[PDB]
Each structure stands twice: as structure tokens, then as C-alpha cells.
Amino acid sequence: KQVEIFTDGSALGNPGPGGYGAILRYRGREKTFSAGYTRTTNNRMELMAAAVALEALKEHAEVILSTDSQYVRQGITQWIHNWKKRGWKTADKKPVKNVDLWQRLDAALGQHQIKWEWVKGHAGHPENERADELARAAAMNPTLEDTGYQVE
Hints:
Layout: E1 2-11, E2 16-26, E3 29-40, H1 42-55, E4 62-67, H2 70-85, H3 99-109, E5 113-118, H4 126-140
Parallel strand pairs: 1-4, 4-5
Antiparallel strand pairs: 1-2, 2-3
């Protein structure tokens, strides 16, 4: 009755072609999601992976989401609630970097019960390693445009 989610994102530049990988497991079966983008960043792909995986759930679910992304971890544990208080802007009044994706992720997280597993390394986390392989394979064959990517 719980959904296990494992995500990763990767890009070949800063900005360059990138992609994500997401694996969803529920009631012993798995589903895989992966897509590649022409010009993006590692952080956007790491964040997009989690949003996409949470979007495939079409009803409230109890979720264990495992990701080794430091970026996603800081957003969830330190940044998002402060950014909402400040209307999604930094102190210089610019929109937060990647606000499009943070808002997409935030929408999805507010419908579920999520236990976040912040993993550190591929050893002993085979699904996270597989999600990394998926993301890298998608970066090698991009088909989509990452419309919200902006320089700097």
C-alpha cells in the first residue's frame, strides 16, 4: 500500500543536454519514466524527476521518495517554506531560480504523505543507480525543450 519512488537527473553541461529517470514501485510492480531535454542543468533535471514521479500518482498516496539530490534536499528541508513566505523571491526581489519547477514540485507534494529518503552514494541503492543510468541515457537522446530554463 505504499509507493516507493526513486529519482535522479543529469546534464552534460551548464547548460547542456540532460534528462531524468524515475522508478515507481507499488504492490510489487514497477513503472519507469525518463525524458531528455536539449538544454538544461543537473539541478533542473534532479528537480524535474521528482515532480514528474509525483505527478504520475492520481490520488492521495503514502510515498517513500528516495533521491540523492542535495538540491532537492535543501529545497524540501530548508528553502521552500521560506520562499513561500517571501512570495517566491530572493532578497534582491528576483524570482527564485527554477521557481517554475519548485512550484510544480510543491503542487505535487501537497497531495500526498511523503517520507523523503536522502541517499548519499550509489552503493547499496540499486534503484537510485538505475535512475541515474536512465537520466544519463535520456541526456544522450534529448527530444524535448526545457522551456523554463533561463541563463544564470
